[PDB]
Short mmCIF file of C-alpha atoms and ligand atoms in Angstrom, two decimals:
data_model
loop_
_atom_site.label_atom_id
_atom_site.label_comp_id
_atom_site.label_asym_id
_atom_site.label_seq_id
_atom_site.Cartn_x
_atom_site.Cartn_y
_atom_site.Cartn_z
CA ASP A 17 145.02 115.72 165.44
CA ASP A 18 143.85 115.18 168.46
CA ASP A 19 145.35 111.93 169.11
CA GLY A 20 145.10 112.31 173.29
CA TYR A 21 149.03 113.26 173.07
CA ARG A 22 149.37 116.54 174.74
CA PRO A 23 151.42 118.77 172.48
CA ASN A 24 154.74 119.65 174.21
CA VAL A 25 158.33 121.31 173.80
CA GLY A 26 161.86 120.69 175.05
CA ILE A 27 165.06 122.44 175.57
CA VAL A 28 168.65 120.73 175.42
CA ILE A 29 170.85 123.60 176.53
CA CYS A 30 174.30 123.01 175.56
CA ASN A 31 177.92 124.26 176.57
CA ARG A 32 181.47 124.04 174.29
CA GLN A 33 182.35 121.18 175.94
CA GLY A 34 179.92 118.24 174.96
CA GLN A 35 177.68 118.94 177.98
CA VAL A 36 174.14 119.81 178.47
CA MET A 37 172.00 121.29 181.28
CA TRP A 38 170.26 118.98 183.58
CA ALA A 39 168.12 120.56 186.08
CA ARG A 40 166.98 119.40 189.74
CA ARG A 41 162.85 118.83 190.09
CA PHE A 42 161.95 121.43 192.52
CA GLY A 43 162.16 120.37 196.13
CA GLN A 44 162.93 116.63 194.61
CA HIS A 45 165.88 114.75 193.94
CA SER A 46 164.36 113.70 190.02
CA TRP A 47 165.94 115.34 187.16
CA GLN A 48 164.94 116.35 183.75
CA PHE A 49 165.61 118.75 180.65
CA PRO A 50 163.47 121.80 180.83
CA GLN A 51 159.96 121.01 179.26
CA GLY A 52 156.65 122.55 178.91
CA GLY A 53 153.33 122.68 177.30
CA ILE A 54 152.84 124.32 173.88
CA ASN A 55 149.72 126.58 173.95
CA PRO A 56 146.61 126.88 171.76
CA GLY A 57 147.74 129.67 169.33
CA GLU A 58 151.25 129.34 170.01
CA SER A 59 154.41 127.91 167.80
CA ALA A 60 156.35 125.01 169.40
CA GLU A 61 159.40 128.05 169.00
CA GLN A 62 157.56 130.67 170.94
CA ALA A 63 156.52 128.42 173.79
CA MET A 64 160.11 126.81 173.82
CA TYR A 65 161.17 130.42 174.60
CA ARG A 66 158.77 131.10 176.79
CA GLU A 67 159.75 128.21 179.12
CA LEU A 68 163.14 128.60 178.68
CA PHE A 69 162.75 132.17 180.60
CA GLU A 70 160.36 131.07 182.69
CA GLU A 71 161.84 127.41 183.49
CA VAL A 72 165.72 128.66 183.76
CA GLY A 73 165.62 132.19 183.48
CA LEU A 74 167.45 132.68 180.03
CA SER A 75 166.48 134.88 177.10
CA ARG A 76 166.78 134.67 173.21
CA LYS A 77 169.78 136.73 173.89
CA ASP A 78 171.10 134.02 175.99
CA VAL A 79 171.64 131.43 173.47
CA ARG A 80 171.89 130.54 169.94
CA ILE A 81 169.25 127.99 168.66
CA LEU A 82 171.50 125.27 166.90
CA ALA A 83 169.38 122.70 165.85
CA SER A 84 165.25 121.64 166.01
CA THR A 85 163.28 118.77 165.22
CA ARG A 86 160.76 119.04 162.42
CA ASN A 87 158.70 116.03 163.65
CA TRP A 88 156.88 115.04 167.09
CA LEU A 89 158.49 112.70 169.23
CA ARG A 90 155.85 110.77 171.02
CA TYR A 91 155.86 108.85 174.62
CA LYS A 92 152.47 107.40 175.99
CA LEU A 93 152.06 107.97 180.19
CA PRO A 94 152.61 104.68 182.04
CA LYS A 95 148.78 103.11 182.07
CA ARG A 96 148.83 103.70 185.75
CA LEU A 97 149.51 107.42 185.26
CA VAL A 98 147.00 107.82 182.97
CA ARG A 99 144.74 110.49 184.83
CA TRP A 100 141.53 108.97 184.04
CA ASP A 101 138.21 111.48 184.62
CA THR A 102 139.91 114.84 183.84
CA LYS A 103 139.80 117.38 180.82
CA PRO A 104 141.16 116.95 178.72
CA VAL A 105 142.70 112.93 179.33
CA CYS A 106 146.05 112.87 178.14
CA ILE A 107 147.83 109.59 177.29
CA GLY A 108 151.03 110.56 176.81
CA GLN A 109 152.93 113.77 175.12
CA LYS A 110 153.87 114.81 171.46
CA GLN A 111 157.28 116.88 171.62
CA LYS A 112 159.26 119.16 169.76
CA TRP A 113 162.85 119.65 170.77
CA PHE A 114 165.47 122.53 170.46
CA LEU A 115 169.07 122.15 170.61
CA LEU A 116 170.47 125.90 172.22
CA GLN A 117 174.10 127.21 172.85
CA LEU A 118 174.29 129.23 176.02
CA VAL A 119 176.44 132.00 174.82
CA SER A 120 176.66 134.08 178.27
CA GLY A 121 177.64 132.57 181.42
CA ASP A 122 176.58 130.06 183.75
CA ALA A 123 175.43 132.98 186.41
CA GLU A 124 172.62 134.00 183.86
CA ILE A 125 170.71 130.76 184.51
CA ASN A 126 167.87 131.90 187.40
CA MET A 127 165.45 129.40 188.00
CA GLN A 128 163.26 131.47 190.10
CA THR A 129 161.53 133.48 187.70
CA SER A 130 158.26 132.16 188.19
CA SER A 131 156.24 131.92 190.82
CA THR A 132 155.75 128.37 191.02
CA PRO A 133 159.45 127.60 189.76
CA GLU A 134 159.88 123.88 188.21
CA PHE A 135 163.60 123.30 189.28
CA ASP A 136 165.52 123.84 191.88
CA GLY A 137 169.18 123.22 190.68
CA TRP A 138 171.05 122.16 187.89
CA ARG A 139 174.77 120.96 186.54
CA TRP A 140 176.27 120.27 183.30
CA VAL A 141 176.37 116.70 182.40
CA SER A 142 177.48 115.06 179.62
CA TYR A 143 175.24 114.73 176.27
CA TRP A 144 174.28 111.44 176.49
CA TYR A 145 174.06 110.83 180.31
CA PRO A 146 170.31 112.29 180.35
CA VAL A 147 169.47 108.96 178.11
CA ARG A 148 170.07 106.51 180.68
CA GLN A 149 168.85 108.77 183.32
CA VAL A 150 165.38 109.93 182.36
CA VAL A 151 162.56 108.04 183.41
CA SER A 152 161.80 104.78 181.93
CA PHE A 153 159.00 105.73 179.46
CA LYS A 154 160.93 108.71 178.07
CA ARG A 155 164.03 106.94 177.03
CA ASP A 156 163.23 106.16 173.03
CA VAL A 157 162.39 109.65 172.85
CA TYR A 158 165.54 110.81 174.67
CA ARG A 159 167.57 108.57 172.69
CA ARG A 160 166.43 110.47 169.27
CA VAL A 161 166.73 113.46 170.25
CA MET A 162 170.46 112.85 171.72
CA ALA A 163 171.14 111.01 168.43
CA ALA A 164 169.97 113.93 166.18
CA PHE A 165 171.83 116.82 168.08
CA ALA A 166 174.80 114.51 169.16
CA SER A 167 177.23 116.16 165.99
CA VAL A 168 175.98 119.94 166.57
CA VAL A 169 176.72 119.81 169.95
CA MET A 170 180.25 118.16 169.34
CA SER A 171 180.86 120.43 166.47
CA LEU A 172 181.39 123.17 169.21
CA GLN A 173 184.38 121.77 170.98
N1 G2P B 27 159.43 108.35 189.92
C1 G2P B 27 159.42 109.54 188.90
N2 G2P B 27 158.32 110.29 188.13
C2 G2P B 27 158.39 111.09 187.17
C3 G2P B 27 159.59 111.07 186.68
N3 G2P B 27 159.72 112.33 185.71
C4 G2P B 27 157.84 112.27 185.28
N4 G2P B 27 157.24 111.60 186.34
C5 G2P B 27 155.74 111.78 186.82
O1 G2P B 27 154.89 111.37 185.69
C6 G2P B 27 154.00 112.82 185.42
C7 G2P B 27 154.19 113.65 184.16
O2 G2P B 27 155.58 113.98 183.81
P1 G2P B 27 155.84 114.65 182.68
O3 G2P B 27 156.93 115.27 182.70
O4 G2P B 27 155.42 113.58 181.46
C8 G2P B 27 154.79 116.38 182.53
P2 G2P B 27 154.54 117.08 184.17
O5 G2P B 27 152.74 116.70 184.72
O6 G2P B 27 155.14 116.87 185.14
O7 G2P B 27 154.63 118.77 184.40
P3 G2P B 27 153.46 119.68 184.65
O8 G2P B 27 152.86 120.73 183.26
O9 G2P B 27 154.47 120.99 185.60
O10 G2P B 27 152.30 119.36 185.53
C9 G2P B 27 154.49 113.79 186.83
O11 G2P B 27 153.51 114.17 187.25
C10 G2P B 27 155.60 112.58 187.74
O12 G2P B 27 154.30 111.77 188.66
C11 G2P B 27 161.01 110.46 187.40
O13 G2P B 27 162.04 110.56 186.72
N5 G2P B 27 160.89 109.50 188.32
#
């Protein structure tokens, strides 16, 4: 359903110590989970693996999919950030999320695989910290994502 919401996939990568991977936006001081659009003809899961390698340098063999979200979670952009006169105009995102366990070493994370790298650093953070730190208009989504994944993450410790 074309609703003004652009289809998107997000990635929560965890370890065995209750932590998730938190990535620093390239040349910036702001942080986020990896995320990116789902292309026409693509499944959310295929899009997830693609952006996992493009943004984090990890492949299918480096992770286990522990959980995912069946349904969209939507946020609307802030009115001022709405890019008017663009095609297609986008009033927010509708997102599926995947919870991945990192089963390779931390050294396999490589954020330089693309020619326009999305991030320039990363660090482990406790799994609920992103909920408090994500830009305001994403917070309801992140609350729902982490509440769905919290039990699984903790069952590894
Ligand atoms: N001041 C801040 N602005 C933010 C933050 N996160 C996102 N944004 C702003 O909102 C815009 C949309 O960010 P989104 O993450 O929803 C999708 P984005 O367009 O950034 O990804 P690309 O496909 O790589 O262009 C983005 O271009 C920034 O201007 C943040 O932590 N702080």
